[PDB]
UniProtKB/Swiss-Prot annotation, chains A, B:
UniProt note: pH dependence: Optimum pH is 6-8.
Tissue-wise expression: Ubiquitous, with higher levels in roots.
Binding residue positions for trans-zeatin 1: 7
Organism: Lupinus luteus (European yellow lupine)
Record EC number: 3.1.27.-
Record protein name field: Protein LlR18B
Binding residues for trans-zeatin 3: 132, 135
Family note: Belongs to the BetVI family.
Gene that this sequence comes from: LLR18B
Length: 155, 155
């Protein structure tokens, strides 16, 4: 099945500024802000739709890793979608997880990031722990990037 | 005179975790998250009340620094107060600035950071540019530490 969940994250950061950090500069930000994440390397691609990246997090004894595919980037509507297509960080019960982000405008020139996470299960059931852990991990990357942009006016 | 402005900041971080971050680990966190803050040097003290710190920042080609004294740290009430007592970063119109921070219980086991900025002016007027810059700098330090804790549950 395909299980979809949605959250909204208001932010004081302007859409265009948050969108650029989310889509062009997140490879440099995420490793800086998240301790565990050691590196972000491009496996194939030029940064646009279709690019595959390997993100390595130090722990789980020595390591862990996940592979992300960028599915879509739409500057006009501030939509950014990516999938976790593999890696030890993708639970065995799942085919893939997709994150769809859209930055709506919020009060005071801020943003409201609508984040929908879709779980592509192998079967008919979705574990609660699997759902919760993946949502936290995806929300944490959004926050790492948004928090960085807040703390660094002009970067 | 003394001009006091207060703002509230909801957060999903629990009071005890955010309090620990703000008062024990901010010295390490702040220079990692905020690009222009070059360093945090303890001038005197061990980090507790009474400690004096020199925070050096760097813009365009321009360096500037400010001296912070930790005024109070009350763990039971989650109050953390510090003052900016001098430095090229403190405006000539001011004697000092005092940030009074208090973490209230928020919904979801999260918290509400109530931050009060007190400007101790040499005269009877406070410049708008001076008020906004200081208020932004101070909110930035709070948000930089909070963003870091959200991104790293277990640092």
């Amino acid at each position: 099945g395909v299980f979809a969940f949605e959250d909204e994250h208001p932010s004081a950061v302007a859409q265009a500024k948050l969108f650029k950090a989310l889509t062009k500069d997140s490879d440099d930000i995420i490793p800086k802000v998240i301790e565990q994440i050691q590196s972000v390397e491009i496996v194939e691609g030029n940064g646009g739709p279709g690019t595959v990246k390997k993100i390595t997090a130090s722990h789980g004894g020595h390591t862990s890793y996940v592979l992300h595919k960028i599915d879509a980037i739409d500057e006009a509507s501030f939509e950014y979608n990516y999938s976790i297509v593999g890696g030890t960080g993708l639970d065995e019960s799942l085919e893939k997880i997709t994150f769809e982000s859209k930055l709506l405008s919020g009060p005071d020139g801020g943003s409201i990031g609508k984040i929908k996470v879709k779980f592509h299960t192998k079967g008919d059931v979705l574990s609660d722990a699997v759902r919760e852990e993946a949502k936290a991990r995806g929300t944490g990357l959004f926050k790492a990037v948004e928090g960085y942009v807040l703390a660094n006016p002009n970067y």
